[PDB]
Amino acid sequence: ANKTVVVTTILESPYVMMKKNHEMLEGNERYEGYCVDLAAEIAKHCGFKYKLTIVGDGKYGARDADTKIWNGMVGELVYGKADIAIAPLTITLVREEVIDFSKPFMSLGISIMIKKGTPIESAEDLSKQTEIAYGTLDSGSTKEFFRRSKIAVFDKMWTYMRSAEPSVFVRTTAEGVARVRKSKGKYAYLLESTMNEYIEQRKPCDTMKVGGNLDSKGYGIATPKGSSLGNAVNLAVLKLSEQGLLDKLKNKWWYDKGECG
Amino acid sequence: NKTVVVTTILESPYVMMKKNHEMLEGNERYEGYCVDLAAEIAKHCGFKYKLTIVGDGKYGARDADTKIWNGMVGELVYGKADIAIAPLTITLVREEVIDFSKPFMSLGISIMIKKGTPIESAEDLSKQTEIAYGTLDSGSTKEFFRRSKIAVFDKMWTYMRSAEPSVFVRTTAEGVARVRKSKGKYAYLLESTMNEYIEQRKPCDTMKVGGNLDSKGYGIATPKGSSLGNAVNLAVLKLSEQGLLDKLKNKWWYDKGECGS
Ligand SMILES: NS(=O)(=O)c1cc2c(cc1Cl)N[C@H]([C@H]1C[C@H]3C=C[C@@H]1C3)NS2(=O)=O
Ligand SMILES: NS(=O)(=O)c1cc2c(cc1Cl)N[C@H]([C@H]1C[C@H]3C=C[C@@H]1C3)NS2(=O)=O
Ligand SMILES: N[C@@H](CCC(=O)O)C(=O)O
Ligand SMILES: N[C@@H](CCC(=O)O)C(=O)O
Ligand SMILES: [Zn+2]
Ligand SMILES: [Zn+2]
Ligand SMILES: [Zn+2]
Ligand SMILES: [Zn+2]
Ligand SMILES: [Zn+2]
């Protein structure tokens, strides 16, 4: 028995990042971040050894409408490439039907990121104007939220977003962030609040979150349907939440060493 | 097949008796957030149910000597109810004996004061005595404090467990009434969700002060390994994603509110 648990995750600040001198280190030591600290804690409390591995396609997880094949981390779990996922992977209905999620370890909601000074303070504002273009991340839960909403106003935004050109979608969060920064207030980015708040406390401190969140959910630790890790992992998340560890890690990576004062 | 027995608790604004309940029968006697949620869950899972108010009026705790569970948790554990649809907090000790769906509402332990009371946080309370403070018996908030190592809370616990007259109450309505009648000499520790509701109701003399002490949520509970478990979880995710949960929240907290705004 006793096998090293394969952990799929994704390079997304400040969840998982490459260490300054990663080239001179090996294994799990090459990485640092919120999810790296949580992984160690989860493995420690569940009593298993693990190996962190970055998803090959660098995606979170979506199902191709044609081929019906899941990509990103969800795919890793569904097709047997990984035993567990420890990343900012949002708990959703479609995913929940093919994989298991522990109770959420972090909260978030879809929010709006703008370049400071951009005349926009809500989603209503974005769906009403047109000088300012907006989009989301590809293959993520935010894009799905809009494509599946039945709430008139969000459908209105979807109607615009997926027919807009040039494309308003981006491959990575960093890509969307740069687009906001280089577009002089003519591009707003729809992303999860946790990430929005993180970038907000980072140089050059030129972005900010405006308005309230569009929804409420959280990230969960995922495992293959019917896996035997699920039970213990869930109990580990509950213990860590009640002992204050999750709150501690949140401040450590978001606010403790923020650089916008 | 058989009608589902639903244990819940009389707690505003989750479950309350309609002003004309005397002339009503069955589930129609009640109204509230959880009343509406149960109707939704039942419809999406395809079952008929009977709302039953928990016998002892408690949420659920374990007697340290007999190891017997009381409240809604006991109802589930001893086979008296098939499901619990109420503002029941997801906790480690409970998860060991019953199952919880994904959270359907967020909350954190908070502080309620009579408007004008000189308290801005948990520290202000911990380091003084002219103002007494307590929690609800047989609940998760009380457990939080008796298991808190975090310096300030452990200190708050030592005071609470010994103060005379008793600082604890057996219903939220009791704790709230005591706050309103003590002239700022008593502060109450309760979940933010309930604190916020009371704050919007006349006589509009109470206040939510400081930030939350922790972060968690309520979940629909079922007996371990119960059949309903899976369907109920999928329903909560669906209700959450289609905006149904957000809709009920505004309906029962802000929509109809008495303190203006
Ligand atoms: N804002 S709230 O308190 O009304 C609230 C809180 C929450 C909601 C939905 C609403 Cl509306 N959904 C999430 C649920 C959706 C999926 C992600 C976490 C669970 C499963 N739980 S939550 O984070 O506890
Ligand atoms: N504040 S946070 O975003 O760092 C955060 C968010 C959450 C935490 C803990 C922290 Cl610290 N715990 C809860 C967990 C505790 C139990 C109640 C809901 C789950 C199970 N999930 S959560 O509501 O998503
Ligand atoms: N956390 C999201 C990805 C980011 C986003 O969609 O904005 C997911 O799990 O799909
Ligand atoms: N929601 C709590 C009861 C209220 C409280 O503890 O403040 C529970 O499930 O025990
Ligand atoms: Zn490098
Ligand atoms: Zn630990
Ligand atoms: Zn406006
Ligand atoms: Zn419905
Ligand atoms: Zn102590």
From Swiss-Prot, chain A:
GO terms for biological process: cellular response to amine stimulus; cellular response to brain-derived neurotrophic factor stimulus; cellular response to glycine; cerebral cortex development; chemical synaptic transmission; conditioned place preference; establishment of protein localization; ionotropic glutamate receptor signaling pathway. GO terms for cellular component: AMPA glutamate receptor complex; asymmetric synapse; axon; cell surface; dendrite; dendrite cytoplasm; dendrite membrane; dendritic shaft. The record marks I120 as: Crucial to convey clamshell closure to channel opening. It is found in: Cell membrane; Postsynaptic cell membrane; Postsynaptic density membrane. Homotetramer or heterotetramer of pore-forming glutamate receptor subunits. Tetramers may be formed by the dimerization of dimers. May interact with MPP4. Forms a ternary complex with GRIP1 and CSPG4. Interacts with ATAD1 in an ATP-dependent manner. ATAD1-catalyzed ATP hydrolysis disrupts binding to ATAD1 and to GRIP1 and leads to AMPAR complex disassembly. Interacts with GRIP2. Interacts with GRIP1. Interacts with NSF via its C-terminus. Interacts with CACNG2, PICK1 and GRIP2. Interacts with GRIA1 and SYNDIG1. Part of a complex containing GRIA2, NSF and NAPA and/or NAPB. The M4 transmembrane segment mediates tetramerization and is required for cell surface expression. This is Glutamate receptor 2. It comes from Rattus norvegicus. The chain holds residues 413 to 795 of 883 of the full protein.
